[model samples]
Target chain A: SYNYLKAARKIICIGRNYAAHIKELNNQPFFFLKPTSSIVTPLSSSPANSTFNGLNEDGTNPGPIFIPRGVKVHHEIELALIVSKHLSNVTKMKPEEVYDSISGVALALDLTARNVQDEAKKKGLPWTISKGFDTFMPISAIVSREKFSSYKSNLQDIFRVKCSVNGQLRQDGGTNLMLHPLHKILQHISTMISLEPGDIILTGTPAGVGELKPGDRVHCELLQNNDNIVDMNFECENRPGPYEFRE
Target chain B: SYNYLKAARKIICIGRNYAAHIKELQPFFFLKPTSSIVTPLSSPANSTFNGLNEDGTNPGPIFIPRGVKVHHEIELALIVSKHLSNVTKMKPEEVYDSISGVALALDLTARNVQDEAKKKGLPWTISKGFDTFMPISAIVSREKFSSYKSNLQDIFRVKCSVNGQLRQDGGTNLMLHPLHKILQHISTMISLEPGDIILTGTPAGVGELKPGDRVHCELLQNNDNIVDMNFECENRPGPYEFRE
Candidate 1:
């Protein structure tokens, strides 16, 4: 297991953080929690990769995402911030203090069961089931804090979030377009729930969110100043048989 | 931290499990990150549970976040004892084997926030998840309820009162989805591991908690008291602003 993944207690995702994106979806800014069990990080890219539900043979990329039964899953590309230490009541903290608590950054997919989520929305239900499934969150190996210096200064325009499925592009945008900004997103979540080391905070996605299907090869990258800081690959496939437990 | 709290990864709460709690929806559930949990034994650093008075009862001050009307929902929480992934159709004992303990829990909600989210069809994450939102009682090990293993519905009642006035009094048998069914539904989509808690929704009398109030909750097995908890409330502070 990746050290961060092993220590993770929660995966807090910010929803509708892009102004235009929120208007497109007709939604408001909010946050939700993903189980630590949902994390699927690429192997060989870091200290080691976790043996999650589905893994690729080479282990260089997180394997085919096991599409759960009967749901249309969508891909959301975003910058993920890994907490370096325990953070609580960050609303009152200074930007630098808040920035110092972030240990690393990565590219992550906030996978969603679009169909399930739509229905949940119509019924005013929690999107937990739709957003929570094994292998739902596929992340690139982390870029250590030291490597990605100036957490407070460069975030807005320095990084570009990109995603492609089957070698064709789907999502493309810059972190500068974020409506809530990184620090505020962190402040909002920390105000609601405590964040601990290894906890992943997804800083919302850009415009081009779309669907994923079986046999599709997905490529995502985090670029800084036009250079690739980190990237990952993943395949999509249907999970065999029904869900099983108690093994 | 208590062993279970230390191991807790997520808190999965079932909504509308009790047919009467229709203030919400069906077979639906939400997550209240472990940060929301406060047991009689331990409180999160950000919470307002000042410490126990010399008399042992807490001088609570469960902070009512700035502008929201906080509501207390009494629920029966089943704490997982083992790692359960996609498990279903298990024998009563096997189901019980997966459970470590049971306790009385309060699912505090920002009623105003929740109602607004419902109207707009937004996620209820912030509405229900906040520091000190869930106040749990000390856990009662599985052995204490082994007699009801095969028939968990017979485990008896869960009750709550505010300032000496009973607000909710419901029985486990009244659950729209029984213990086994709730576990099966959750595990089908999300894995339940040791320390994870499953709050089986609240009973009918869901109402608001004002400042300077004392809330009490208890669990009963065969009409005999098993667990009891006391919580006091106070406003977090004024001048709270929402950036959005």
Candidate 2:
């Protein structure tokens, strides 16, 4: 399959979409951009030993999530939307219009650097550097929109997203818990930034997001009611790099 | 003909890069989606909008979404030549080799929204990520600067004018965090690939923009104009309503 994952030009993350998650984090609803270079498929090998090569999609072995040295990383599981068409400054879009623009959906992780993020939050700096790193986004194969035939109708409660770290459940919720629906999020994005055919949007996570330790195992799933649609497992390890940020 | 701008995946912008600009603050960086990039209207004397395959057709005026306070920030934009991840171990010369071209750019911002974000310690993305926010000139490839390969940083002066009144005029030599150092710092944070763009921080002179304002930006080397771009601002049309 020709992977849209490898070609996505932009990754827009909608944060604080879940009410409880927002309360737990004590953060206002927000959005931010992640470099396309942060994406890594769940079963690809790291192309550069110490440097990040951005995208490596040969799906043989399970993906190894690299934890940047000396930083505390957290895993926030969510649903990912792959834009299928160009959409800009859309006004009061219809459900079909919103649905048609999405090519597919996937199970993904919005990995964040907790320490860096807190500092940025306190200093009024951009979250780009904190949220962006090689292998920051670990994703599963996309499930075509055609398969979700009722997406337009049940857009809010389409899937049950779950994540586990070290064999213990860390997050469990349904899309129904989303504070903002897919259509509304898409509309909000188009009004602010344009969406292109190869763009990806990550809806926010549910509560229970926690830190990832080196050598920990992570397993994620996107379930359609009681049936499993996509499954992925990754192991976290310290990233090997020669450079370090100095004070 | 430079087609690299059209294929750009990300635009990394350095903020408070000039000491005067930060009068200012610590150097911080942000990401502007490729969606924010737009070509300026072709000048009457010019046959093309730089090297884009527009065939002399205009992408039209910039849309300033209704009732928003927009500002123009002029800066030197660099086109990355190859994949760069962790260049911390490399020398400055090797870092300079990573740049393939140069252009003039406007790191447009929604000031009103940005202030609100800053006050609340929020992500500035919503304010800086809007469409039509970045107006870029066509790329001036590396070969054009082959004669001055060793000192590309000290040669150019970047300036911008609004409605023909020069508002910003600063030389690249004044940049506190020079281009080479900025590139190296960025690579340690995130990967940059060929076709990616880096907007070196803007000069100190930045002001708000209203509808109907014309923005002119240019890059010069030793009194010689290398490249320039023109854009007129107009309100983005719509009955579009934003709900937050």
Candidate 3:
């Protein structure tokens, strides 16, 4: 619902942007989707601490949404860019133009079912079940355009991106490690679909992608300054089992 | 472009509706996107496929149109309840009020990258890739519905009374078997989202579930009888390699 209010129409992502992540997953740069329904924002006025429920539209009464039977869900951290203007067939955009078109930046988690994805790959299946699903993508607050402008001048300069689970540091790196720069990544993505206002672009994660379990405390941040940091915290709960639809 | 058609809005799917398929992938349902862009009939009409190069506002040579990485996918079949009109929460309704929605189902695929999906437990991610689309959900033919009504007395009985109640039934048993069952076997299967469809669960012959799963299985049969079963099969290669 928070994503709906933000009016985000498209979500752009860069695959295999990090070297260590590429080796960990043993794959090349690829793209995927996460519907707006999956996005959650902590800073929004909505009850950020609410639990998720799986609703079955059929008349049958299924039990509480259960954790998918055997999949290993993992968390990925990245520097997310929110766009502010419509740009299609982007070939060569200036940094100023790119900045002008961007709405702001935020910290995000690209949750994945690594085990399921691996199994789907072995069977020659799609990754939709593993990657594209409700509650798969969780985002932080939108650091408005005005806030971004005042934060830094060199948008491409190195910024710390990190993720931790239950107080243990799992992933940490700087933007300098990115294979495809943010501007170029956006250029390539726009060629496929128009980047509308409020769209999000996940610049990809650095090395150290790992598995997460229930009750784990997860945190992410964008280190724009030595002292100033934009971050969020989340507590993982057991997957919601299936339930009967009431509406 | 095909999914963008005026008549195509709701994307319906079937789960564990086929018996032989269960032996292959286990009992679980699958899903696909129902949009005009994925439709083959509309592919030629979409400008996205024009294969043109132009200067974009971003000041780069943008490729306007080109062949989308297409993949083919397969799926089980089921129908919806037509008489089921929209009702707000807390409203009581009779089973007879729900109409029977039926059809032959074929989930289209990109036919480009299927091997990757086999190696991994993730199929929808790759199979649902660009241009790997599904066909329009055609309501049961008038003659079929008429016969169904006469034989069953009430159409809702076929969907509701049956253990596998079309779209409403949930649980491992309700899912298209094998792949979905295997996905459950992996001990990390996720829940099905609203309007999200599943495919032909999978057969046990499936080897490993690894990262970078990519593959597309196309559904050729239009009838539920054929589509629900082993139906037709075509495939595409997937992109899986170590990044720099």
Candidate 4:
């Protein structure tokens, strides 16, 4: 089968979505991108990420989650949204408009390499490599909002995003805790760039983010009503990449 | 007429390309989505405004985020033709062969915002990722550049003039790294799929785009310097604009 990302286009990430994550970074809510090329989709039978090559349906073999060479990889759990409607340069959007734009939600991992990132931060360099790498974003199958769909329900109200490293439970939080709520995030980003159907957005992470040692397993799930609506599980191993920041 | 999405909306950009721009080690690349590429960076307060496409069609006036000064970085945009993963062993000509098309584009940026972010060691997203932040010329296929067939050392030039005064002028050969090497280098970081567009870093003369400014960009090659294709930039007709 094909990876679901074949159906999506660009992936937009909201940094510092949660207040604690913000303080942790010593920064404010800002934006960045994860190329759809970086998406790693899991299969129905497998508990982790693969689909390194969309052209061929071959996923990853069971092993250590390979960390790109030179990167000090860290795993972050974020709420992912699939944009369905086109919203562009909209400065004043009604609550209904924001709700209408989000078609589905999923549990996503904003896999980052803090080693590459911190240095870039000190140098004022673009975080393209720091935040971006092959198989860096592992996502759960999308669960349509129509399941609990409500325009007036204030979707921004609490929804839980949690992740466990090797079953130890590393990240845990409620969407209500995000520094910028879903609606506000949509409103803010559209002013800078347009939103398209099938576009992906990773709404930052909670605190508890930590390093990913090889042989670590990661499991992510979205909670509402104490039920896991979206479940994503993956493992991390190591690999010697031709994986470099430069030539 | 379409989203102008040749394939994917991803645009990978390189900064500090010219030998004069030595701003980095070898060279570095960044990324922005196609959703950020619009004719007008933002919605105009008034009804009448738009930017002109290469075909002379108006995508319409652009808009920018409030409280920022946007600068224009003219560049050569390349359209990749196939999935390229780990092509480090491939020759540069093979890398060039992978390109299906090219376009001229604007890497619009918010200078003040970028400056602050620069100080904080933050990503250049807000400064470079706004919608309509990039305006591109129509794609020209490899067939069109048959004259340069194997040698593409001098196919791109850009001139940004406010009110028709020359502000920037440059050619591709001035770049510290060749275009193919940069693309090849990116494949190491992330595989570039077909339909992906890359901005071959801007030249030395980048400046602020003032309200009511007319800027011209061109892509020309050949020993004679005959013009290949050009893009025109003009401002919205209004008094309420960003203030210094």
Candidate 5:
């Protein structure tokens, strides 16, 4: 029984942090808000009555939760940092200090409603309605900071990342490809608002972007040669939207 | 100043409780979840700013920090019982003894997006969106029973009673609308879920409700004796239907 929202005060997402992802979408670094309500808790397996209702269990179509009707939703997988304490203006802060602040790492699926985002870009409207809907942000288990104590010494290194849907591999990359490092992202966000306990920082995703549809089962894994660090799966469901709006 | 999420739990809401509002909206009830990040403290004028951006003169739209947008909202409101006591199943003999729970009320509103809601019949949704947005409720304000009271008579009456009997005496009207009879509609709901509270009932004449609906003047007063008679303007916004 994890109180996800209670543990998280803010979720800071870095867009286009991956080169291949930016190339595919032809976009620049952007930011979006994921309402705490949109966080989907991952179950060990699909429930007995699970109906890939709004999601594409088959992985053919992009899930309805992400791609607005008559729009495209590109999937971006990234390494997420769950902050454990409050810190601001971390630009000049050292990497060791940044690592000290993180409580753990988690896998995050940055589902982008590309069509609505494009519309917002054209009209200069905020993209909150497109990305901030409930059930939009799906997260994996938190890998505690102690588990990665060794990596803290040399935080900037190649870490294996892979994404698969229905046994078909879609994305495979390493942390070396990231345009912006985790330490820098922490510094950038801290300048604006205080990063309190449980604030999530989505690092960004790699290339091989695809649409998620109902019946599509998303499987994300973090690999290190022969050993697998993290593996999780999510089945899509068709839930209603219009999460929220502004004046 | 209001405390942050650490101080609040859940937000509860009621829909179409007002008779006049039912006629205006064609009669229906709806509910939604308000995120904790959106709740804010009310300013000096009692204006609840959705997005609070710091500016001296000529302030910008009521803004919530971050990339999110804010809207103006207005809603009929109520709070809930704060005690941890439970009401699993009261016996018939003890039903009268269970009158010790109640809460407060507040008309929640979002100052920024209030105009858009007026343009659309979507005011209800916006007004009710946000965590801990409902007015407060408490149990101390409830009417105590004679047996529990030290020395007070638990008696009351209504203006429309007829010769020691309640008015609107028809079978349907009697069962539907009785006078001075307080009936607690608590059977349908189970344990008050964490963060859930009951709202005060709304009255009739709640038409064309909007964010900027003036609070200074009582708009629904009757022309005659001007007692409980509620009235509304002839014009109101149209039904909401989202399209391209």
Candidate 6:
């Protein structure tokens, strides 16, 4: 498959990393998994091109995104990493060691069905139905590791996460704003299950993560040490019915 | 390789912390999406995995040992193998006479990998992991063996064929150390614990596997029907046209 992240073993996401994003929701940093099959990559400059349920999510295979009536979907913008090697049963690693393990970085949109997630969390049910869906994860091209200045700085204190809707800025987050930095998050996951080469990690999103609707042009980015290293853009084109995740 | 990952999908792995930032999700289902899935060739599970056979012939691992050069040893694999840590003298001999059933298994060893680890006194985790590794087939029971209780040597023929050609063919009677004694010898260094398995050795035709090989292993008895297994050696693909 030519689709993005085709080689990825899993999609590991951290929830409530940003304190402002957490005060209203769950307070602690929680993790979840999203199916790699649901990933799509954007190549165009316009949101009008967004489609639904396409094949493998490779562009030109436009698939209709049919959200059920009265359902609310939210967009979470965050920083992502592409692992370069295998890591399992890890307790800790020095800052340089963690940095050396990451091969690339990118911006990602963790599209979520809030109503579905809220209910799942409440019932102690798996959030697969809410978080896993075709077009649920739309990521940008990866930028190599050499492009960054350093990995040791408290991640939240440096970078910022921003997103815009229909060209209007809706979400603005600072890394200094994060409760748990990327360094610690990586250690947590490696020591938890294991990280394989090509696995993608989505650090939590910032506050101001609100609703997404059809015809809305969504653009998100990462303001690195001093430059905007990477960013991802997409559209929310929802149809009226026939909604589905796994076919 | 063609894969459905029906084997390990939703792989709720509990090798336990098994990851630390990954630790918090341990309480429930922090499940992976399409991660660690493998299928029998290409068939597509709340799973309770064991090396037991469902019905048929000789059981085998039909296992894949990725990357490293692996040597195949043909041997009889056991079933209902569980933890029997006792307050009494729980010797290997005590452990073997009690195992409920048996089957033929082809266990693998990444010979060179282990040698390198031994030079460093490293643990036995690497040479045995990732990419088509560790498998034991379904089994055959002692109840089906007519004279296993009387002589124990009745644990008859075990055969393995690669790409339709017979390779390793041996019988239990020729085993240097029978089941009870074999388990008895290693009981001290090993736990002989439940959910864990050990291998004896394959017979006459042990050797290296080629990319074009298809391993079909079978177990036969003096009386009834037998079971056979096949392994597809190749690079397996992911996901598919799945339906609910």
Q: Pick the candidate with the highest DockQ.
A: 2
Chain B TM-scores per candidate, in order, are 0.86, 0.88, 0.36, 0.80, 0.34, 0.60
How close to the true structure is residue B140 of candidate 1, measured as C-alpha lDDT?
78
What are the runs in model 2 whose C-alpha is more than 4 Å off? A21-28, A44-50, A56-63, A150-152, A243-247, B21-25, B43-58, B239-244
lDDT of 5 by residue, A43-142 (tens): 6422121112222232121222332234455666778888876553343556676568787777777776666556555544444435544346777667
Off by over 4 Å in 1: A19-28, A43-63, A91-98, A150-152, A241-247, B21-26, B41-60, B238-244
Q: Considering the two chains of model 5, state its CAPRI-style docking category.
A: incorrect
* Candidate 3 CAPRI-style tier: incorrect
* Candidate 6 share of real interface contacts: 0.05
Model 5 C-alpha lDDT per residue in residues B23-51, reported as the tens digit of each score:
43311222332222222122222122222
DockQ, per-model, please? Answer: 0.35, 0.46, 0.13, 0.38, 0.03, 0.04
Candidate 3, residue B183: lDDT: 23
- Comparing 3 and 5 on DockQ, the stronger one: 3
Judging by TM-score, tell me the better candidate of 1 and 2: 2
* Candidate 4 regions with alpha-carbon error over 4 angstroms: A1-4, A21-28, A43-51, A55-65, A92-98, A150-152, A245-247, B1-4, B21-25, B39-58, B223-244
lDDT of 3 by residue, A4-68 (tens): 22355435466678766445433244565554434544532241212222222321111211223
**Which candidate leads the pack in TM-score?**
2
Question: What is the descending TM-score order?
Answer: 2, 1, 4, 3, 6, 5
Which ten-residue region of model 4 chain B has the weakest summed lDDT?
B42-51
Candidate 1 residue-wise lDDT, B1-244, digit = tens: 1456666677898887676644432468888876666655333555343322333233244667877788999998888886666664565456687788887889999888888788888888888877678887767788887877776765669898999999998888778878877776676677676777889888788878988888888889888998777888876642344432
Q: How many backbone clashes does candidate 6 have?
A: 34
Residues B1-244 of candidate 4: C-alpha lDDT, one tens digit per residue: 2234546546888888876654632566788776555442321343232222343333543455456787888888788887776555555466458788677778888898889888988778867876557776666677777666565756666555556677777878787777778777787777787778988888887888755565666666553433333333444232222333
Q: Measured by TM-score, how close is model 6 to the native structure? A: 0.50
Indicate the DockQ of the complex predicted as candidate 3. 0.13
Candidate 1 residue pairs that clash: A244-B86, A245-B85, A245-B86, A245-B87
Clashes of 5: 43
How close to the true structure is residue A143 of candidate 2, measured as C-alpha lDDT? 83
